[model samples]
Target: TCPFYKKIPGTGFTVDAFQYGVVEGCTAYFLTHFHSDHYAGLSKHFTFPVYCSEITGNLLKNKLHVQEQYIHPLPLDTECIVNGVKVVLLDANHCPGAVMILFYLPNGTVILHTGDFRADPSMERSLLADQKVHMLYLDTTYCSPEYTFPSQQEVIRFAINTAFEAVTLNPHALVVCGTYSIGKEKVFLAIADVLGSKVGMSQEKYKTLQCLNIPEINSLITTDMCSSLVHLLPMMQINFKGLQSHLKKCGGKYNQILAFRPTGWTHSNKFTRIADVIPQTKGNISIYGIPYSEHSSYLEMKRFVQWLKPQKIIPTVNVGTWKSRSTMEKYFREWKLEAGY
Candidate 1:
């Protein structure tokens, strides 16, 4: 079974399941966020009502050019009835518009589809704290015990200080941060704040960031490439040759480049502390892979299930691999039993 596009049982709603082309089995579609992996099958030519967070609505309209009529924006913490079932969006802390979709059925069933998230203590005080969830469609991206990365703030702080210290010593290195369409915005923004440098990125990324409605971010942006010391680039272009050519293209105003790939897969978990996850340097270019992921860590995932105490748990990632899915289930069972649930 494909967990990504599974239709919520007893409801016509499908969460992040657009890849099926024509959505014939459901009456309405629910998109968690604007991430490509989630909204892969959605197209401009499609004709189905889609529900998502307000910011993601902007992405659908501006980025993908999906028609406004079919796009429904759900305000955070506010409950709305879709096909007579109550649905609410809770901040997933995954990205700007990402959310955990909560569906309360008329028959007293509650389903929580955590699109993609980074579990933090803030969730403990959220609206979901009291509710009894029946089915939790979890994002098990880092389900293994070895995938335990530290807190997001810890990683982001490290990135900020590292960039700040490097530039203080050299003062001429361009701090290039790799980012996806929406996530990983925190790393670069904080780095820019501490370094007192503007974040320079392509107009496409700039427009996408504008859609995020981040306060005072406009002042931090510079379309003029060389004027900004902190450069935001696509994830794949952060390599040595890819970055070097970019430096040459920018007229070599910055003597060197300090690159950071802020994604979860980069962390080896071989070190105890986040600071020990060091950089790979060669010549004038230093590349650092930061384990700053939007997905929840193994410990975070365990904590979430124990906190929510959902009646049933569904592995959202690694569903295609039977072995991986079963391995993840073992953790869930172990955690549930350990918590005496």
Candidate 2:
């Protein structure tokens, strides 16, 4: 009953993850970004044609080794034709090269797949003007009203300043930032720029960053942690226990470890506050969870729906469960009522 893939009825165009055999004969496919969860079954061996941003296309070719002939790179704010259907690309504002895809079907249906994005008001001028959005495939990662978080700019400023303050408090302590392999490049990049220190990361991540071709992100390779004062580790590798395990081997070379995690999950429960520096300290290591998110919060999503005013809303994730469906509907009803629509 729940559909994972968004397929136009007449046209065989599919968006995002290829679930339930939609990949077998899809006329054309679109990828929103290079996140592993979104691009699940796609591999170098995929023979079907794909449409995505230029940076994403480059990653597929260089990182995944996908053939150039089958990959199509679409520019931002530009409309392109593929298999007789019109498609427009807009910045998703989630990660470095993420995009929201708008498909204009031959039968006059306008479908928008917001793969994974945080709403920015500037998008209204391009997305919410003139054209009517028939159906919206939303990224309701934090769909509940309890999940209110601040804007990315405010969160980033807080993160940068927190790192600087941490260093000031403990001049000899090491500063570590946790991030995914691809999504949170900007967090570390901003810290480096503000502190005026060279940032270091795993060689593999450095190569991936280089392939992204973003000039502003210049990071050095730090495996053993000797080169720089600031180090970036994989998100999964930055927990309290994990940090302690590494600190055991390093001995007494550093005074302490100050870490920060920029994520939205901090607001999932009542334990964490928005924009507040929440800390976890154990012996020589300390970590803070900051509210920096790439997906829309309840208020932002509500405002976005009020602005776009789509005819139908589809919850992209957790749709297969009963409780999830109920929560999604409840939030939508509340937002619609508040917006007076």
Candidate 3:
């Protein structure tokens, strides 16, 4: 997304992460989430206040390991003030720490900024449902008429089912998957579906997964719980090269270890990198391409706008550049004399 203004020379504002700001005076900016594309250059800026939900704060502190001078985190579903701005946190539905902003101004203007969203029913329910908002700045990353993706729950189910099947199909093979700690909790859930109390997760994920607390949905164990699975197969860490070599060591007592890349297995680029060192074994090593994405599809974004039907609509972030900006430009040209700003 192109920034609003790169250099407001006299205003003392310069662009960082494509958002125009003189951080010294920039009272506040709603950090919807800490994802790189949105919050990339925040480290370089100096501002009185930054705002996001508590989930984001926890993630920033522990997951991303960011240290900041000042951080204000409000609980999810709570409204709070930051730099005199009345804001409420809504579930962005993109990730664990991601959130959207609902700015309730003194002038009675309700601005809903949908940072990046997806169609996860649980997240939608947590978001308090779409309402009659005055101004809605939605995520149009997938706002085109042709894109689509599976919901988070469905993707997790499919991944788990496939993982279980992969293991069962060839019990003598090794399965390894690369994924991030937070982003792939659902995979942990999938692993749970396959393994049950036999699995264990890292302390961080265990805390988060505990909150969801659906024991039936959570049946997988982290490799740390490998001892518990003695009846089936010994657990192996996804990143431990020594453990992997031992599993594949010819004539080893172990039959095969099913491992999956926690991440980096992608159609876009990481496939070759993953292939560079795939263990050559007598048993099979299957790589699954779930093509899972957290963002909403183009058609879904369009539908979100159509359903909301705001009094006035403005697309912020990037889509404003190509689709929203240009689409509205030509739209007004034929519909009215007032040109889009």
Residue 133, candidate 2: how far off, in angstroms?
1.4
Query: lDDT tens digits, residues 1-341, model 2?
Result: 21544665566777774444445557777889988877777777787888899989978888788999889998998878878878889998888779998888787989888989988777888855869998899998888878877676777888788878877887777778887747776677787677777777677776677767676554433454566777887788899887777666555767788888876665444664445456778887888887777888777888888888887898787677899999898888877787776
* Candidate 1 lowest-lDDT run of ten: 1-10
How does each model score on lDDT?
0.84, 0.77, 0.51
Question: Candidate 2: deviation at residue 184, Å?
Answer: 2.1
Which candidate, 1 or 3, would have the higher lDDT against the true structure?
1
Tell me the tens digit of each residue's lDDT in model 3 across 1-341. 43543222222222223244445444455567656666655553344355666666665555444565556677878867655656677776676677776766666667676777774435435544645567666565554434444455665666566557656776544444444434545654456447443544356555544434245534454435343321222223443564456455435444655554433223333233312333333343333445456677654554455555555655554543465678654532333333222
Greater-TM-score candidate between 1 and 3:
1
Supply candidate 1's per-residue lDDT for 244: 84
TM-scores of the models, in the given order? 0.95, 0.90, 0.65
Decoy 1 TM-score against native: 0.95
List ranges where model 1 is wrong by over 4 Å: 1-5
Error of 2 at 36 (Å): 1.2
Candidate 2, residue 277: lDDT: 55
Clashing pairs in 1: none
